[PDB]
Design a protein around this ligand. Structure first.
Ligand SMILES: *[C@@H]1O[C@H](CO)[C@@H](O[C@@H]2O[C@H](CO)[C@@H](O)[C@H](O)[C@H]2NC(C)=O)[C@H](O)[C@H]1NC(C)=O
Ligand SMILES: *[C@@H]1O[C@H](CO)[C@@H](O[C@@H]2O[C@H](CO)[C@@H](O)[C@H](O)[C@H]2NC(C)=O)[C@H](O)[C@H]1NC(C)=O
Ligand SMILES: *[C@@H]1O[C@H](CO)[C@@H](O[C@@H]2O[C@H](CO)[C@@H](O)[C@H](O)[C@H]2NC(C)=O)[C@H](O)[C@H]1NC(C)=O
Lengths: 33, 49
């Protein structure tokens, strides 16, 4: 992830999560009930 | 289970670019409805004749 200092970890999919969602997407799915 | 698309891995690196050397003139169709059939119903005649 060498993008010249630009960080996209909060929007790219998280490999640690089984749902393969981004942290922002995971938060969005948790916040809607 | 339906496939979403063909898998393509973009050859990203911090100092390489891809420049087109040619082009295609592509014509595509877009169909849009504009109007319907103008229908009038006589309410008195439909209910009662
Ligand atoms: C991109 O951003 C993420 C999160 O904003 C960075 O991850 C953090 O890294 C520091 C030190 O490496 C840790 O102390 C934090 O706990 C991490 N946060 C999370 C949420 O994991 C990451 O280092 C940044 N840079 C790259 C290259 O990914
Ligand atoms: C530009 O170079 C990259 C790597 O030198 C090419 O990407 C490779 O393409 C082959 C054929 O599809 C794959 O088997 C490799 O896995 C690719 N490597 C990477 C790192 O993606 C790329 O095709 C080249 N671009 C052009 C237009 O020739
Ligand atoms: C750019 O693409 C066009 C096709 O869209 C190429 O034209 C073809 O050239 C070959 C070889 O001379 C001919 O056999 C074909 O009949 C041509 N096709 C058409 C539609 O004219 C053109 O050569 C390409 N140019 C470059 C620089 O790659």
């Amino acid at each position: 992830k060498d993008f010249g200092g630009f960080n996209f970890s909060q929007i790219l999919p998280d490999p640690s999560k089984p749902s393969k969602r981004s942290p922002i997407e995971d938060l969005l799915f948790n916040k809607v009930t | 289970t339906m496939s979403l698309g063909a898998e393509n891995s973009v050859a990203y690196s911090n100092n390489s670019i891809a420049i087109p050397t040619n082009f295609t003139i592509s014509v595509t169709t877009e169909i849009l409805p504009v109007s319907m059939t103008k229908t009038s119903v006589d309410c008195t005649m439909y209910i009662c004749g």
